[PDB]
Amino acid sequence: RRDWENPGVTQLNRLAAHPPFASWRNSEEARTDRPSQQLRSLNGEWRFAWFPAPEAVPESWLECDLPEADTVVVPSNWQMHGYDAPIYTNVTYPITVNPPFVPTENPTGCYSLTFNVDESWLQEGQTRIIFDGVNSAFHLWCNGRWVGYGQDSRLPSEFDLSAFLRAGENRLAVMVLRWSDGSYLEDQDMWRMSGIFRDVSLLHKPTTQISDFHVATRFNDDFSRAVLEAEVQMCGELRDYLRVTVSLWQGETQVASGTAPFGGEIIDERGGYADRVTLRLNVENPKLWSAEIPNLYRAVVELHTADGTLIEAEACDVGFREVRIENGLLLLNGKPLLIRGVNRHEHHPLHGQVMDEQTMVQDILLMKQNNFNAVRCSHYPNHPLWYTLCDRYGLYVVDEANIQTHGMVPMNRLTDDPRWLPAMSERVTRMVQRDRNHPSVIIWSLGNESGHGANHDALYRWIKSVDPSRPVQYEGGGADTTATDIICPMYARVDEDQPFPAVPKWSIKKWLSLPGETRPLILCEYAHAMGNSLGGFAKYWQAFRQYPRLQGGFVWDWVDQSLIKYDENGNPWSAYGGDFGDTPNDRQFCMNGLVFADRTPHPALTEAKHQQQFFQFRLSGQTIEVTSEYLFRHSDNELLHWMVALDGKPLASGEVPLDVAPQGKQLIELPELPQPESAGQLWLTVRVVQPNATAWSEAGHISAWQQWRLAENLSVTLPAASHAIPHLTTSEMDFCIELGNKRWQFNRQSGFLSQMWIGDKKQLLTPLRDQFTRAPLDNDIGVSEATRIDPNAWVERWKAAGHYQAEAALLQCTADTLADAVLITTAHAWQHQGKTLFISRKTYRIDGSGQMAITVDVEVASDTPHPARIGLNCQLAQVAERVNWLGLGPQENYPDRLTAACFDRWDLPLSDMYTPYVFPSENGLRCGTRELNYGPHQWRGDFQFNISRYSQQQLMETSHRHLLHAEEGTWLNIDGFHMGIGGDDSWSPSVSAEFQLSAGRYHYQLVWCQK
Amino acid sequence: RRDWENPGVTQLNRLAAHPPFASWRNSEEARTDRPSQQLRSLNGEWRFAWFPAPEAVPESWLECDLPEADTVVVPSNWQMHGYDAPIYTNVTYPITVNPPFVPTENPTGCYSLTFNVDESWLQEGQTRIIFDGVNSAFHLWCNGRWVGYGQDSRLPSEFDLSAFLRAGENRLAVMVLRWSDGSYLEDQDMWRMSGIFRDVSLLHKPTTQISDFHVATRFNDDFSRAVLEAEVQMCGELRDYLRVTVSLWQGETQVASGTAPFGGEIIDERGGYADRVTLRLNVENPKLWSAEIPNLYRAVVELHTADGTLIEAEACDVGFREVRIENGLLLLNGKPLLIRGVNRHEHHPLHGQVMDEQTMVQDILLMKQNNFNAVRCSHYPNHPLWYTLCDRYGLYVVDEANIQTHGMVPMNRLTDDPRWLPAMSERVTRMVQRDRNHPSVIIWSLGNESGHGANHDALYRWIKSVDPSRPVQYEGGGADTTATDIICPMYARVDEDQPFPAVPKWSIKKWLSLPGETRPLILCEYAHAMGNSLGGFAKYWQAFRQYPRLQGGFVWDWVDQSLIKYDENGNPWSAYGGDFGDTPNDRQFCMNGLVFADRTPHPALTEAKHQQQFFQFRLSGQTIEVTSEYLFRHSDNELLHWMVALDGKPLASGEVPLDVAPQGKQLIELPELPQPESAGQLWLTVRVVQPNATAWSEAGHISAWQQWRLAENLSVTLPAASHAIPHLTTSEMDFCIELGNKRWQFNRQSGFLSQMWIGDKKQLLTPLRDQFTRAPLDNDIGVSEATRIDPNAWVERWKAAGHYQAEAALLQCTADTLADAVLITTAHAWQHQGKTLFISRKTYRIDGSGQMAITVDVEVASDTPHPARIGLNCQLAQVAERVNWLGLGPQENYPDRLTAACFDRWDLPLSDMYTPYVFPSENGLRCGTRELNYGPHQWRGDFQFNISRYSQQQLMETSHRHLLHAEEGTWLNIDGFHMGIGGDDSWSPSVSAEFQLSAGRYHYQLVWCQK
Ligand SMILES: [Mg+2]
Ligand SMILES: [Mg+2]
Ligand SMILES: [Mg+2]
Ligand SMILES: [Mg+2]
Ligand code: NA
Ligand code: NA
Ligand code: NA
Ligand code: NA
Ligand code: NA
Ligand code: NA
Ligand code: NA
Ligand code: NA
């Protein structure tokens, strides 16, 4: 029959979808969410054999274990055990595009298990097997007898095994296909993996059973009264003595209870549902659920007889919350949401797409600790535990149907085809049937990047009909179609229009006010966090705060999709697409996360945390205004610490308790600050600290911060006249300057400081030279490759103009003796094929104090692409343990991503001054720096710098971070000016005009001396 | 696999649905709609073997013909050849209700055909088979090899046979199943038949082919400009030299043309459809399509090369029209429709559910001739030729999906179940894909009586998305749900509310103005035409005309669903449900047609014609005002004939051409009419006559009529005093009156006129007695049965009150002699077990002129159910050929169904005074009669009458019309008063209060004399 090549067959003998069941036979166990004896896990050691096609599977495998088979752990993806390569591709399909057919060579995973069943399970009731996730399709046998078939990798497939099992030993056989017609709806850009990758379980239900239940909560106008409505469905024989009781619990306190026999209200001419009942419980002053305060109740559904004998019980966590769009605003409990969201794929660097509790909790804690309140299930229903954890920890969830057809041409080719409506309907309907009782799910999504087809309109309406409690969104076909309640674009910019034909990405501010438009706007994807990125992140949040109908968005994305590989020595290294031998591939485009695969933060995470802060600050005189952005909670775990420092030297500090109502304001008057005697700039830093630990954070957690410049006292005092006078020694090749045992050598051929000496010790391994380039970031490169060059990309514009190739031509090199100093004057021109790109004019002034004052004035040809940087570089002989600077830090920061960084005195190990981006680039920059200290050296001015053991050349020429080698000495890059990093997306230039180096003429000055 | 018990499997290897194809290889043949050699009919003689189950089918049938098999005509229903019994059932399922399972005893029809295929068909291109209608499911084999599977009895199933066929002799094997999971969606109230009941064909297409095309017509504000947009899709290899030309023709004149290569506009980020193109043709002053003037163009779609070589051509008829709902009104071409509709099942008394052109054309002609402009496809897509004929003759069509689940408890059990959404979607989507190019289709329907479920809402939105040119309607779940653009109730009454729980049927006038309601109301079913019915029909049309938003409805229904059976002598008779040995059955509830199965009209059809007239009339003095109800056409085939008569005697007549604009008025001034010499009532009759023949009518066709009373001259002149004096003779048992040769005998024990003589000739066979009962109409009975009594039904109320058993008790019987007359005075009481139901007081006055004046005064007990009639009856000895009367006629007419009848002198054969309803009842009544003549007898007064060879007793006791026997003499029923017939529905009392005999006291008077 080849059911895996037929979209008319998505399942065979599969049971109906339903909310999580456990079939408790004790009500109290249901109430407390204790493990149920009737729900058994079949996870663990299974038998597995790989085959090139389903035709290669020997008939004997159905009857008994194959000797060639291995013992593997389930759940698992079989690629993670090295049976075949995990394929990765971005836009194009991993297979030949000819629907509904798949390749004849279809990797087949043969799973089997020998397991025990209690006789009590078979003497009464129903025994079913539950596969929470099988990728992408499977056939099931039990004791040699065929049971059924299933598709959709991301939802549970359940089969009745009551007629198949025997008491004692039984054997399952599961034939898993890598490719099916299901694969055409599963084109998410990620590692293409297969197998039994989610839990396998056995569930025993009584013959007379709860088959479905739906929980709704309606509210009065001010949410002081609620009605919990619970619809319960049954299967089996209806009897007059049957009853349903629904009880509601707040912790250990029962708040309400209701009992009724079966028999629903009349709904049409033929009567009503005899096999259903709806219970209604009044709740006075309900404790409302939100991400801020995840108040939960417990609902217990008891199926029983009139005399009080329990048949079975089911239960769920209930969150009293209302989600509605009104007057163009998404409201939760009557209040407008501001979505601090992120997209999160299910990814583990070691276990692939297998999810576990520890990884999930780790993600949620890190998200909430970094001021995220929302998550998008990109792009499929998640492991069932995810929702439980989001209910309890408090996160807003967008639950998304497992439908992506991004490789189709055009994108809507399947989704506009009525012949694919059945298969698509199943992916939407079975998701809703499973997850509808979770309070954390506030929005349904119809899938991702599948264009806009009629099937979307149909399924949009289906959800609106069955579940009016949640808005429906969908981005395909231009982000504002008739299939979405929310304008939900991907990578629409703040101020800049991108007017693509048919599917424009308008400025988000402009999009809101288009003729006739009234809906809220929440970006389903924004701020592409690929490599050194999140440039311009602050621009989004300023817009979100200013515009009521701009209600936030979901960052792309949470975690790098890298996998661990082992070299010749067996050492682990982070691998991306193309490293597993898969071709065609899309290189490092799978790594766009705010955290590394091991959940170590990227520098961008702190920028996200700062901008997503829940308290806003203003300073007027001595008064600090604190405004709460919380909608529900008072600031009952918040203390404001303030500190005033003169150039990093602390002068005054204090702490004030925060007492701010939701949306409220608190004024804090600072005490009289003493005027410092010394020159310099006073800086005020405030931080919000959480004194008490929570479910999601430790005691002392910092949740918010802000800085201001206070009084500045400019230095007017002249330094004391120096006793020593520097001497100029002139040879043919060199201008030399001597001061005691110190020496500065300027090569007259090159026109650069070629060496410095302190006694017999040399300071430089490479001369001090101008630098106008950086090792290209992911955003500089875009989609440009060696075989497919994108001439628009920043790196290619730099390469074509000769920026990386330009040679310094000496125009001038003179030396003059002043009264108290030696003045070296130089001029250079960087040319490429007759074209002067840059001109650098310098003076070097060395006086008796041992200070070298360097003045730099650069010309940049108006018609050359704006340079990545304007600065100097050298390789220092010194290798020191610590780096000490007065400037923005402590973390890496760039001009369009420095809001999170604070001005202060910072001291870090040299290793912290390098960011280990998997794909090496310009990294570790610190801006707004007024003083830098490294070993004996001190640099003073107003500059940007990075400092590491890796040259810009090595970073540029090395593909992976694990292939990098520490060079001799220390490479220093000191920039007068540095270009923004961008990141609005990673496939087109995204650096905003104000962060491009376009002024034409630039000036900076430095002082180099010994500390 | 048992695919016929799986709602997830509705087809295997079935090709996509599409508009009618013929694959012409000649453009002129496509333009002219001539037969195509590439479309071959496989209709004719096939081989057939019946089996009790699919398991009972021998494996040799796949390869070789069975000797036990018979030769049958295809298309056919196998129940019509007597293989098994055609089951009839209304609300209940004919099978055990256990979805998706069907009975193990599942009658299986094995069809096979051996046929020739020419090598040329297989050498190149694609050969497909098309089964237009197979009931209910089937597997297909070709030359022993399995091809595919299909469900949905009412749409074509198509399969590619290109790889299966061989040059020369080929054999098809079709295993048809009576029951499948498809049956759960096919629970229409009709005969349950099966087999290959629509056409079978072979279609040859090239490999590079037109695979789909859609035609839209859009207009400017005043319909003076139009754009025809034609989307053309292809299959096969795309080449740059490929072209599509769409040409539009008005007869033999090409009005527009457009040519383009393949490649549609960009629709998303992935581009557009390379295999599609859209052509736009401008049309100035288009001739518009309507039911009034069915103007058609021909669109020809040519697939060709750039150098001019035709590959293939497809085509369709195009009607330029716009259907939209605006401000609560359904509009066609800017004008509000008034739907004069009827429901039409596909039924033939000899061929069952097999349809032919002759029958279809016969139905359409009769419909249009009786002023119908609309048809509802109750309850499934029709034979493809139906739409062609409606396009060409001009009828508005509601195309309805083959979805009915009336037997489900509750009615929406399947339609609210997402697991049934795939199967339901196919029934909707494949209908739209087939029929979307037909201009006659103006409204889509989601099916019938399937409650309201979320699946309806999903499919409603699907249609709205893919085809915004047509409104969507659906009655289920209360007629006004979110799945309907039109309030479309079944059997909602005009003034009377029926407030059923959950699904009330409001008064249609009330329904429109319910809080928040804005939609149009068109009844999907109304005026149930079961037996002697359509009482109160005029009430609907008065309402339709008065209320803008009441836009008509569809009568239930067109044709009686009786079948032909034969007796011992081979004489045919009409059989209903239960006559074919099927049980449980719903008796004569299959016969609700306006015409008999052979298309002979019921009397009700003339009432429909008159009420649905397109011209309205008013009279003011001498002025006749004629108002056109046409929306588009001038009255360019209409002449007004007027006649003035005095008690049936013509005094003046004339004719005036009608020249009335649509919606316009014409005033016609009648000439000076001379005052008559005689006493009596002048009557004016007008009729609209069509002088010219049309496509749908003959010359002289009468389309409209109306009558008014003019001047009346009351008779004041005393008749010449009669010389003869009647004489009274008294015995103990009789009062006898003598006048020359004439004798009247009144029995003194009974109190009735027992005999009359003229010479030796006796006039009566049964005495003249009061009658208060009628042989019960289908409406009087409702759903009441002998085993299941409905005590609310009129017949049961009458029975329980003793009306049929009432025995006359004599209270008074006297004889008086007047100067010139004999006076007989009588009084009777009708009592049932001590209770007096009626009292009748009479006088009989016989004077010297031979005239017997009868005065009747009746008392009806206020607490007895209102009587069916208040009259007299007798069995006359005479059998005469003709019946002549001055009153309403010529056809049968009742108090609530007499608007179509005209007051004139009528003369018919006796047999025309009996209406042969298949289920015998009171019939043949004529109302408002002032004079009746039969043989030697004349009756004068103001009465209702019927006259036949059948007593009320025989009509009541005889089940079928073919079992009736002419009794001796002639049964005369003369009523002072007669109850209404009702018919708003036929399962509850429907006789309106104004037509019930509730006055308590009644008076009428008759004169009986010799003519
Ligand atoms: Mg399949
Ligand atoms: Mg700041
Ligand atoms: Mg089926
Ligand atoms: Mg009239
Ligand atoms: Na906002
Ligand atoms: Na990605
Ligand atoms: Na606090
Ligand atoms: Na690199
Ligand atoms: Na109307
Ligand atoms: Na019927
Ligand atoms: Na005329
Ligand atoms: Na009868």
Short mmCIF file of C-alpha atoms in Angstrom, two decimals, chain A residues 16-264:
data_model
loop_
_atom_site.label_atom_id
_atom_site.label_comp_id
_atom_site.label_asym_id
_atom_site.label_seq_id
_atom_site.Cartn_x
_atom_site.Cartn_y
_atom_site.Cartn_z
CA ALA A 16 -8.52 10.08 19.08
CA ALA A 17 -6.33 12.91 20.39
CA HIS A 18 -7.05 14.16 23.92
CA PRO A 19 -5.50 16.14 26.81
CA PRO A 20 -2.83 14.42 28.98
CA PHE A 21 -4.28 11.34 30.74
CA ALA A 22 -2.98 9.19 33.60
CA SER A 23 -6.13 7.27 34.61
CA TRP A 24 -5.73 7.56 38.38
CA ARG A 25 -7.80 5.07 40.40
CA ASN A 26 -7.35 7.26 43.47
CA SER A 27 -8.75 10.81 43.55
CA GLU A 28 -6.13 12.15 45.98
CA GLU A 29 -3.28 10.98 43.71
CA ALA A 30 -4.95 12.87 40.84
CA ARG A 31 -5.27 15.98 43.02
CA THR A 32 -1.57 15.98 43.98
CA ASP A 33 -0.30 15.02 40.48
CA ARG A 34 1.42 11.93 41.91
CA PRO A 35 2.58 9.22 39.44
CA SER A 36 -0.16 6.85 38.30
CA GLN A 37 0.28 3.05 38.38
CA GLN A 38 -1.88 2.99 35.23
CA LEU A 39 0.63 5.04 33.23
CA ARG A 40 3.82 3.08 32.56
CA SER A 41 6.93 4.37 30.80
CA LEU A 42 8.48 2.07 28.19
CA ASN A 43 11.56 4.29 27.89
CA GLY A 44 14.97 2.63 28.17
CA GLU A 45 16.91 -0.09 26.39
CA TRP A 46 15.40 -1.09 23.04
CA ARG A 47 16.70 -3.11 20.09
CA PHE A 48 17.50 -1.27 16.85
CA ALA A 49 18.59 -2.09 13.29
CA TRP A 50 19.16 0.35 10.40
CA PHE A 51 18.05 -0.41 6.84
CA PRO A 52 18.51 1.55 3.56
CA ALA A 53 14.84 1.09 2.59
CA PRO A 54 11.62 -0.51 3.95
CA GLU A 55 12.03 -3.30 1.34
CA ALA A 56 15.31 -4.42 2.96
CA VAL A 57 13.56 -5.31 6.25
CA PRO A 58 13.56 -9.11 6.76
CA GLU A 59 10.16 -10.70 7.48
CA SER A 60 11.63 -12.50 10.53
CA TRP A 61 12.05 -9.18 12.39
CA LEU A 62 8.27 -9.17 13.00
CA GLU A 63 8.43 -12.52 14.83
CA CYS A 64 11.75 -12.29 16.73
CA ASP A 65 14.84 -10.16 17.46
CA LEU A 66 17.40 -9.76 14.68
CA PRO A 67 20.91 -10.87 15.70
CA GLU A 68 22.41 -7.91 13.77
CA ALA A 69 20.42 -5.44 15.91
CA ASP A 70 22.03 -3.32 18.63
CA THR A 71 20.78 -2.28 22.06
CA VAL A 72 20.00 1.47 22.10
CA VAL A 73 18.37 3.92 24.50
CA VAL A 74 14.89 5.22 23.60
CA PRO A 75 13.91 8.02 23.20
CA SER A 76 16.67 8.88 20.69
CA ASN A 77 17.38 10.15 17.18
CA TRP A 78 19.30 7.40 15.36
CA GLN A 79 21.62 9.94 13.69
CA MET A 80 22.92 10.75 17.19
CA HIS A 81 24.12 7.13 17.42
CA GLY A 82 25.94 7.35 14.07
CA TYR A 83 23.77 5.21 11.78
CA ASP A 84 23.48 7.91 9.10
CA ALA A 85 24.27 11.63 8.70
CA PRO A 86 21.92 14.29 10.11
CA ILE A 87 21.12 16.46 7.07
CA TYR A 88 20.81 20.25 7.36
CA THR A 89 19.32 22.67 4.82
CA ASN A 90 17.87 26.21 4.99
CA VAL A 91 15.34 26.98 2.24
CA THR A 92 15.43 24.03 -0.20
CA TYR A 93 14.04 20.57 0.70
CA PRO A 94 16.47 17.84 1.90
CA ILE A 95 14.78 15.55 -0.67
CA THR A 96 13.73 15.75 -4.34
CA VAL A 97 10.65 17.99 -4.62
CA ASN A 98 8.02 15.77 -6.26
CA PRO A 99 4.93 15.48 -3.99
CA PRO A 100 3.73 13.19 -2.61
CA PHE A 101 6.60 10.80 -3.47
CA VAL A 102 9.75 10.21 -1.40
CA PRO A 103 13.18 8.78 -2.42
CA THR A 104 13.30 5.01 -3.02
CA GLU A 105 16.34 4.88 -0.73
CA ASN A 106 14.47 5.71 2.48
CA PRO A 107 16.52 5.11 5.67
CA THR A 108 14.46 2.77 7.85
CA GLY A 109 14.77 2.40 11.62
CA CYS A 110 13.65 -0.94 13.01
CA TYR A 111 12.85 -0.66 16.71
CA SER A 112 11.77 -3.50 18.99
CA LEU A 113 11.11 -4.10 22.69
CA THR A 114 10.39 -7.15 24.83
CA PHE A 115 8.34 -6.07 27.84
CA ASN A 116 6.02 -7.39 30.56
CA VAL A 117 2.29 -6.77 30.99
CA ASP A 118 0.34 -7.50 34.21
CA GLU A 119 -2.59 -9.91 33.81
CA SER A 120 -4.81 -7.41 35.68
CA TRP A 121 -4.27 -4.99 32.76
CA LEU A 122 -5.75 -7.49 30.30
CA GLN A 123 -8.56 -8.95 32.44
CA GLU A 124 -10.35 -5.58 32.51
CA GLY A 125 -10.29 -2.24 30.68
CA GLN A 126 -8.20 -0.98 27.78
CA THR A 127 -4.43 -1.04 27.32
CA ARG A 128 -3.05 1.47 24.82
CA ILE A 129 0.46 2.41 23.69
CA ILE A 130 1.45 6.08 23.33
CA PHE A 131 4.28 7.28 21.09
CA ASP A 132 4.76 10.98 21.93
CA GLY A 133 7.10 11.53 18.97
CA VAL A 134 8.14 9.44 15.96
CA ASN A 135 9.95 11.06 13.02
CA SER A 136 8.55 10.97 10.45
CA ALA A 137 6.20 7.98 10.03
CA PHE A 138 5.84 4.43 11.38
CA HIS A 139 4.08 1.08 11.22
CA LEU A 140 3.38 -0.79 14.47
CA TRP A 141 3.28 -4.53 15.20
CA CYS A 142 2.58 -6.25 18.52
CA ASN A 143 3.47 -9.95 18.88
CA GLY A 144 3.88 -10.24 15.10
CA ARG A 145 0.43 -8.78 14.36
CA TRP A 146 0.07 -5.45 12.54
CA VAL A 147 -1.60 -2.77 14.70
CA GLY A 148 -1.50 0.54 12.83
CA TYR A 149 0.25 3.46 11.17
CA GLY A 150 1.01 7.08 12.10
CA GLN A 151 2.33 10.40 10.79
CA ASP A 152 3.08 13.87 12.28
CA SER A 153 6.45 13.72 14.07
CA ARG A 154 5.47 16.16 16.79
CA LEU A 155 2.23 14.84 18.30
CA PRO A 156 1.41 11.60 20.17
CA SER A 157 0.20 8.56 18.21
CA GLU A 158 -1.93 6.19 20.29
CA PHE A 159 -3.09 2.64 19.53
CA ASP A 160 -5.31 0.16 21.36
CA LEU A 161 -3.28 -2.97 22.20
CA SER A 162 -5.95 -4.73 24.31
CA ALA A 163 -6.58 -7.40 21.64
CA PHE A 164 -2.84 -7.82 20.91
CA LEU A 165 -1.17 -8.36 24.30
CA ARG A 166 -0.71 -11.49 26.43
CA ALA A 167 0.04 -11.73 30.16
CA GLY A 168 3.81 -11.77 30.68
CA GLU A 169 6.21 -11.27 27.77
CA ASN A 170 5.21 -9.28 24.67
CA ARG A 171 7.22 -7.87 21.76
CA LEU A 172 6.68 -4.58 19.91
CA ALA A 173 8.04 -3.98 16.42
CA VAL A 174 8.23 -0.41 15.07
CA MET A 175 9.27 0.36 11.50
CA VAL A 176 10.22 4.03 11.34
CA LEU A 177 10.53 5.78 7.98
CA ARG A 178 12.84 8.80 7.66
CA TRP A 179 10.86 10.21 4.72
CA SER A 180 7.10 10.19 4.20
CA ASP A 181 4.51 12.46 2.59
CA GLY A 182 4.41 13.87 6.14
CA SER A 183 7.89 15.26 5.40
CA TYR A 184 6.38 17.75 2.93
CA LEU A 185 4.68 19.44 5.91
CA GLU A 186 7.83 19.23 8.06
CA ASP A 187 10.29 21.48 6.20
CA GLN A 188 11.56 23.40 9.29
CA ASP A 189 15.14 24.59 8.81
CA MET A 190 17.02 22.50 11.36
CA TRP A 191 18.79 19.15 11.53
CA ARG A 192 16.76 16.54 9.66
CA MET A 193 16.67 13.69 12.19
CA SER A 194 14.54 10.55 12.63
CA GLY A 195 13.45 7.80 15.04
CA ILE A 196 11.53 7.38 18.29
CA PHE A 197 12.65 10.67 19.85
CA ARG A 198 9.95 11.27 22.48
CA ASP A 199 8.51 9.09 25.27
CA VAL A 200 6.87 5.70 24.77
CA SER A 201 4.25 4.70 27.36
CA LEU A 202 1.46 2.27 28.22
CA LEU A 203 -1.84 3.56 29.54
CA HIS A 204 -4.58 1.48 31.13
CA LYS A 205 -8.09 2.93 31.05
CA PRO A 206 -11.32 1.33 32.28
CA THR A 207 -13.85 0.26 29.62
CA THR A 208 -16.19 2.96 30.95
CA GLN A 209 -13.85 5.95 30.79
CA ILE A 210 -13.20 9.68 30.56
CA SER A 211 -12.33 10.08 26.86
CA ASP A 212 -12.07 13.89 26.74
CA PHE A 213 -12.46 16.93 29.00
CA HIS A 214 -12.32 20.68 28.27
CA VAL A 215 -11.74 23.38 30.88
CA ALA A 216 -12.89 26.99 30.39
CA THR A 217 -12.78 30.01 32.71
CA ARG A 218 -15.10 33.00 32.10
CA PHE A 219 -14.99 36.24 34.12
CA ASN A 220 -17.09 39.24 35.11
CA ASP A 221 -16.03 42.79 34.16
CA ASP A 222 -13.36 43.32 36.87
CA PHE A 223 -12.25 39.67 37.21
CA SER A 224 -13.60 39.44 40.79
CA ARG A 225 -15.92 36.57 39.81
CA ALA A 226 -15.29 33.55 37.59
CA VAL A 227 -17.11 30.49 36.33
CA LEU A 228 -15.09 27.36 35.64
CA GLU A 229 -16.88 25.36 32.97
CA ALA A 230 -15.79 21.75 32.49
CA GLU A 231 -17.13 19.61 29.63
CA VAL A 232 -16.53 15.90 30.20
CA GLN A 233 -16.97 13.17 27.57
CA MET A 234 -17.20 9.42 28.13
CA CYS A 235 -16.74 6.14 26.25
CA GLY A 236 -18.27 2.77 27.16
CA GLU A 237 -21.72 1.76 28.40
CA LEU A 238 -23.97 4.55 29.68
CA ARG A 239 -25.73 3.73 32.95
CA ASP A 240 -28.13 5.83 35.03
CA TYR A 241 -25.91 5.34 38.11
CA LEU A 242 -22.85 6.93 36.43
CA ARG A 243 -21.70 10.34 37.68
CA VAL A 244 -19.06 12.98 37.03
CA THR A 245 -17.66 15.11 39.83
CA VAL A 246 -15.45 18.09 39.11
CA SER A 247 -13.67 19.57 42.13
CA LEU A 248 -11.41 22.60 42.14
CA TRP A 249 -8.47 23.06 44.52
CA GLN A 250 -6.30 26.01 45.54
CA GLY A 251 -3.30 24.18 47.00
CA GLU A 252 -4.82 21.92 49.65
CA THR A 253 -8.05 23.93 49.96
CA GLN A 254 -11.13 22.81 48.00
CA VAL A 255 -12.77 25.91 46.52
CA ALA A 256 -15.67 24.31 44.61
CA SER A 257 -17.29 20.99 43.69
CA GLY A 258 -20.10 19.86 41.39
CA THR A 259 -21.66 16.51 40.52
CA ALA A 260 -23.99 15.49 37.69
CA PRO A 261 -25.14 12.36 35.85
CA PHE A 262 -24.43 12.10 32.11
CA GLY A 263 -26.70 13.87 29.63
CA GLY A 264 -26.00 17.21 27.95
#
